[PDB]
Scaffold this motif. Structure first.
Motif, PDB file in Angstrom:
ATOM      1  N   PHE A  27       0.830  -1.198   0.000  1.00  0.00           N
ATOM      2  CA  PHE A  27       0.000   0.000   0.000  1.00  0.00           C
ATOM      3  C   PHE A  27       0.867   1.251   0.000  1.00  0.00           C
ATOM      4  O   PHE A  27       1.787   1.391   0.811  1.00  0.00           O
ATOM      5  CB  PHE A  27      -0.906   0.027   1.233  1.00  0.00           C
ATOM      6  CG  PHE A  27      -1.920  -1.088   1.292  1.00  0.00           C
ATOM      7  CD1 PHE A  27      -2.690  -1.422   0.204  1.00  0.00           C
ATOM      8  CD2 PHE A  27      -2.131  -1.767   2.475  1.00  0.00           C
ATOM      9  CE1 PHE A  27      -3.622  -2.435   0.283  1.00  0.00           C
ATOM     10  CE2 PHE A  27      -3.060  -2.781   2.557  1.00  0.00           C
ATOM     11  CZ  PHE A  27      -3.807  -3.111   1.460  1.00  0.00           C
ATOM     12  N   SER A  28       0.561   2.165  -0.923  1.00  0.00           N
ATOM     13  CA  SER A  28       1.240   3.455  -0.952  1.00  0.00           C
ATOM     14  C   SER A  28       0.818   4.339   0.213  1.00  0.00           C
ATOM     15  O   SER A  28       1.662   4.957   0.870  1.00  0.00           O
ATOM     16  CB  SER A  28       0.956   4.152  -2.281  1.00  0.00           C
ATOM     17  OG  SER A  28       1.570   5.425  -2.340  1.00  0.00           O
ATOM     18  N   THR A  29      -0.486   4.408   0.476  1.00  0.00           N
ATOM     19  CA  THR A  29      -1.056   5.256   1.518  1.00  0.00           C
ATOM     20  C   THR A  29      -1.931   4.395   2.410  1.00  0.00           C
ATOM     21  O   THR A  29      -2.835   3.722   1.917  1.00  0.00           O
ATOM     22  CB  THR A  29      -1.869   6.399   0.899  1.00  0.00           C
ATOM     23  OG1 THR A  29      -0.992   7.285   0.194  1.00  0.00           O
ATOM     24  CG2 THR A  29      -2.624   7.179   1.959  1.00  0.00           C
TER      25      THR A  29
ATOM     26  N   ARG C   6      14.311   5.231   0.750  1.00  0.00           N
ATOM     27  CA  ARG C   6      13.597   5.460  -0.501  1.00  0.00           C
ATOM     28  C   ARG C   6      12.823   6.788  -0.421  1.00  0.00           C
ATOM     29  O   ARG C   6      12.518   7.290   0.664  1.00  0.00           O
ATOM     30  CB  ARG C   6      12.591   4.314  -0.743  1.00  0.00           C
ATOM     31  CG  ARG C   6      11.924   4.243  -2.122  1.00  0.00           C
ATOM     32  CD  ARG C   6      10.708   3.223  -2.310  1.00  0.00           C
ATOM     33  NE  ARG C   6      10.702   1.813  -1.930  1.00  0.00           N
ATOM     34  CZ  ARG C   6      11.592   0.905  -2.302  1.00  0.00           C
ATOM     35  NH1 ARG C   6      12.595   1.206  -3.092  1.00  0.00           N
ATOM     36  NH2 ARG C   6      11.420  -0.356  -1.931  1.00  0.00           N
ATOM     37  N   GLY C   7      12.507   7.358  -1.594  1.00  0.00           N
ATOM     38  CA  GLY C   7      11.935   8.704  -1.637  1.00  0.00           C
ATOM     39  C   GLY C   7      10.589   8.832  -0.942  1.00  0.00           C
ATOM     40  O   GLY C   7      10.391   9.725  -0.110  1.00  0.00           O
ATOM     41  N   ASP C   8       9.677   7.885  -1.202  1.00  0.00           N
ATOM     42  CA  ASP C   8       8.335   7.951  -0.621  1.00  0.00           C
ATOM     43  C   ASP C   8       8.409   7.872   0.887  1.00  0.00           C
ATOM     44  O   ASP C   8       7.542   8.396   1.593  1.00  0.00           O
ATOM     45  CB  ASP C   8       7.452   6.813  -1.148  1.00  0.00           C
ATOM     46  CG  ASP C   8       6.547   7.228  -2.303  1.00  0.00           C
ATOM     47  OD1 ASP C   8       6.630   8.374  -2.791  1.00  0.00           O
ATOM     48  OD2 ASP C   8       5.734   6.381  -2.732  1.00  0.00           O
ATOM     49  N   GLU C   9       9.432   7.202   1.381  1.00  0.00           N
ATOM     50  CA  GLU C   9       9.646   6.914   2.779  1.00  0.00           C
ATOM     51  C   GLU C   9      10.288   8.079   3.523  1.00  0.00           C
ATOM     52  O   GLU C   9      10.464   7.972   4.742  1.00  0.00           O
ATOM     53  CB  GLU C   9      10.439   5.611   2.895  1.00  0.00           C
ATOM     54  CG  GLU C   9       9.950   4.535   1.891  1.00  0.00           C
ATOM     55  CD  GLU C   9      10.606   3.193   2.071  1.00  0.00           C
ATOM     56  OE1 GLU C   9      11.852   3.157   2.094  1.00  0.00           O
ATOM     57  OE2 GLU C   9       9.885   2.181   2.188  1.00  0.00           O
ATOM     58  N   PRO C  15       9.399  12.720  13.254  1.00  0.00           N
ATOM     59  CA  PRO C  15       8.885  12.311  14.569  1.00  0.00           C
ATOM     60  C   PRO C  15       7.468  11.754  14.508  1.00  0.00           C
ATOM     61  O   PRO C  15       6.576  12.338  13.888  1.00  0.00           O
ATOM     62  CB  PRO C  15       8.934  13.611  15.371  1.00  0.00           C
ATOM     63  CG  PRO C  15      10.109  14.290  14.832  1.00  0.00           C
ATOM     64  CD  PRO C  15      10.040  14.045  13.345  1.00  0.00           C
ATOM     65  N   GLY C  16       7.269  10.615  15.165  1.00  0.00           N
ATOM     66  CA  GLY C  16       5.940  10.030  15.285  1.00  0.00           C
ATOM     67  C   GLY C  16       5.255   9.654  13.989  1.00  0.00           C
ATOM     68  O   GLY C  16       4.046   9.878  13.850  1.00  0.00           O
ATOM     69  N   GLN C  17       5.994   9.085  13.038  1.00  0.00           N
ATOM     70  CA  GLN C  17       5.440   8.629  11.770  1.00  0.00           C
ATOM     71  C   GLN C  17       5.602   7.118  11.675  1.00  0.00           C
ATOM     72  O   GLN C  17       6.405   6.515  12.391  1.00  0.00           O
ATOM     73  CB  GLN C  17       6.122   9.308  10.574  1.00  0.00           C
ATOM     74  CG  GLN C  17       6.025  10.836  10.538  1.00  0.00           C
ATOM     75  CD  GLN C  17       4.617  11.383  10.327  1.00  0.00           C
ATOM     76  OE1 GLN C  17       3.620  10.765  10.691  1.00  0.00           O
ATOM     77  NE2 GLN C  17       4.541  12.570   9.739  1.00  0.00           N
ATOM     78  N   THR C  18       4.824   6.515  10.775  1.00  0.00           N
ATOM     79  CA  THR C  18       4.709   5.068  10.682  1.00  0.00           C
ATOM     80  C   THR C  18       4.925   4.587   9.257  1.00  0.00           C
ATOM     81  O   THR C  18       4.790   5.335   8.285  1.00  0.00           O
ATOM     82  CB  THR C  18       3.339   4.581  11.175  1.00  0.00           C
ATOM     83  OG1 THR C  18       3.363   3.154  11.313  1.00  0.00           O
ATOM     84  CG2 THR C  18       2.227   4.978  10.201  1.00  0.00           C
ATOM     85  N   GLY C  19       5.258   3.315   9.169  1.00  0.00           N
ATOM     86  CA  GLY C  19       5.584   2.666   7.917  1.00  0.00           C
ATOM     87  C   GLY C  19       6.625   1.601   8.179  1.00  0.00           C
ATOM     88  O   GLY C  19       7.031   1.365   9.313  1.00  0.00           O
TER      89      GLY C  19
END
Lengths: 50, 49, 49
Positions: A27-29, C6-9, C15-19
């Motif tokens: 998933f992108s988003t 990576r760019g999208d990342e 701070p306080g982000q997810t993935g």
């Protein structure tokens, strides 16, 4: 669907595993408002619309 | 009503407590007035706000 | 700390982000005092193959 006529499925009477959504690497988003994906498994929802 | 002077104090305090307890049912802008649901739905980065 | 995301990342290393990057690779503390300096390293760290 198309955005003007947006399809809706009302999902009910089932056990839902949300790990598959969060563990997904594609998933992108995945933006969740009001709830967080990791903690979605803990709760039970009266109705879910998709 | 002869003892209204004491009953009003009791009523004021009962009301004071009843108002205070009812304030726990208010959201004050939060997504929910019950603390356990906020902590059950959100992670610290979102729950803290 | 130095690493190639990576760019999208890039948003995740905040701070306080997810993935994937934020959760299992590098997590920035929620109280971070710092600067996230990033550039388009697409012409040094990427090869045709």
């Amino acid at each position: 669907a198309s955005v003007y006529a947006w399809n809706r499925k009302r999902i009910s009477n089932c056990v839902a595993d949300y790990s598959v959504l969060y563990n997904s690497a594609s998933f992108s988003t995945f933006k969740c408002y009001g709830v967080s994906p990791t903690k979605l498994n803990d709760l039970c929802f009266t109705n879910v619309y998709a | 009503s002869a003892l209204g002077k004491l009953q009003d104090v009791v009523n004021q305090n009962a009301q004071a407590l009843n108002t205070l307890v009812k304030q726990l049912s208010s959201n004050f802008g939060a997504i929910s007035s019950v603390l356990n649901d906020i902590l059950s739905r959100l992670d610290p980065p979102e729950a803290e706000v | 700390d130095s690493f190639v995301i990576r760019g999208d990342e890039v948003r995740q290393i905040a701070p306080g982000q997810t993935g994937k990057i934020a959760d299992y690779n590098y997590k920035l503390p929620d109280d971070f005092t710092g600067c996230v300096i990033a550039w388009n390293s697409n012409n040094l760290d990427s090869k045709v193959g």
